[PDB]
Amino acid sequence: PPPTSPPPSPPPSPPPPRPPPPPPPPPSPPPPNRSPPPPPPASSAINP
């Protein structure tokens, strides 16, 4: 007699998930303001 009909192919395995990425570094801080403003020479007396 002929052999029994083979059974159909079985389903494939489930896939794994993916992790999330870490937070990026903060922006570099700005440098301080460019020098002090020119100072006043000062004047008058301030006397009594």
Partner: protein, 48 residues
């Protein structure tokens, strides 16, 4: 009278001496505060 170390003045005829910037030293007087030379640190404002 010369500004005591730890302060500076950059204008002729100023009664008050401004405090030196943080991370900077000053000698007796000085028109401008000279930053720490090379591998050192002041770690305080108006340090001598």
């Amino acid at each position: 009278k010369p500004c005591q170390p730890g302060r500076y003045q950059n204008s002729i005829g100023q009664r008050v001496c401004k405090p030196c910037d943080m991370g900077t030293y000053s000698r007796y007087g000085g028109e401008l505060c000279t930053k720490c030379p090379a591998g050192t640190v002041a770690s305080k404002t108006g340090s001598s």
